[PDB]
């Protein structure tokens, strides 16, 4: 039992590949090293501390959502800056990736179908004693928030914008200043509030 799930986040879509990746899946691993050759001793291998960006490539076909819409969806995702979550069940792969190249093809027969040839890249985020910041931050929320009964603007700021002290960024928006009263502390249920960015 092998399936491929692409769980996008910036667009809340969970694409499951209708058809398995044809002939074979393959994944390479290559350690980071570079030769150094010393006089009268010869070559030596020195490990480099980082890790490498490795690719997963395969090819499928989309049988008769329609294949046209699926191809459009994947082409749109190709330009996405945010990462996609790729899960391959039988193969055992699971992690954030991003599509480097995507291509579709129509054949003389089977014109409804679209033969697909897609490639992925491992994704890593740049964050630019205490707990390490190893967790990926891929969670998404709507750009407009409906205030609940128990919410306070600091609570909204922490839930929807991070540090919690980011509330003046929400308040200073003129639409938020209009829907919210002139007192930031007092807020009401139901009214819409727009987080920044």
């Amino acid at each position: 039992v092998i399936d491929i799930y692409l769980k996008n986040e910036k667009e809340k879509i969970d694409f499951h590949f209708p058809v398995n990746p044809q002939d074979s899946l393959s994944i390479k691993k290559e350690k980071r090293f570079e030769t150094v050759d010393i006089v009268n001793l010869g070559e030596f291998d020195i490990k480099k501390e980082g890790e490498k960006i490795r690719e997963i490539s395969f090819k499928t076909f989309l049988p008769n959502k329609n294949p046209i819409e699926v191809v459009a969806m994947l082409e749109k995702w190709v330009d996405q800056a945010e990462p996609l979550r790729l899960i391959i069940t039988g193969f055992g792969y699971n992690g954030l990736v991003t599509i480097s190249s995507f291509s579709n093809t129509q054949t003389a027969g089977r014109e409804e179908d679209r033969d697909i040839e897609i490639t992925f890249r491992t994704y890593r985020e740049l964050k630019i004693t205490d707990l390490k910041d190893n967790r990926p931050n891929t969670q998404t929320k709507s750009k407009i928030y409906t205030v609940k009964a128990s919410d306070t603007l600091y609570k909204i700021a922490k839930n929807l914008l991070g540090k919690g002290s980011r509330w003046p960024e929400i308040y200073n928006i003129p639409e938020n200043k209009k829907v919210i009263g002139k007192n930031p502390n007092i807020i009401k249920k139901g009214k819409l509030v727009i987080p920044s960015k």
Partner: protein
């Protein structure tokens, strides 16, 4: 169980709308380049359809220079098979057929001068379904 078969004696062939009754063998097949590809998760291999290519063979006894004069010009073949035990007939037409080679010369000893024609056809139409 009942006898409702058909025999080649009932065959009627119209080569370009002309009865070439002297032909005593005809066969045409409509084959498809079915791609067979193997999927990762499925034990069994997946077969996908492809384009269709029509081929036909037609051989009989020579009675004129019809085919040699015809050359490689496109023409049509209408094949009619009629049931005689009960009424009803099948009628096929090869929509656009062309020769693959002219049987220019063929003869041997005292044997009758036989002629063999082989070619391809783009498509077909099914006109009667029995």
């Amino acid at each position: 169980e009942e006898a409702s078969f058909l025999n080649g004696s009932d065959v009627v062939i119209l080569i370009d709308g002309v009865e070439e009754l002297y032909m005593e063998e005809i066969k045409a097949d409509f084959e498809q380049d079915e791609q067979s590809i193997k999927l990762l998760g499925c034990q069994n291999e997946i077969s996908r359809v492809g384009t269709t290519k029509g081929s036909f063979s037609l051989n009989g006894y020579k009675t004129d220079s019809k085919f040699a004069k015809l050359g490689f010009r496109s023409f049509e073949i209408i094949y009619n098979l009629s049931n005689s035990e009960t009424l009803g007939y099948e009628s096929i037409r090869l929509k656009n057929c062309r020769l693959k080679k002219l049987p220019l010369i063929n003869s041997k000893a005292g044997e009758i001068v036989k002629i063999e024609v082989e070619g391809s056809f783009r498509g077909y139409d099914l006109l009667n379904e029995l």
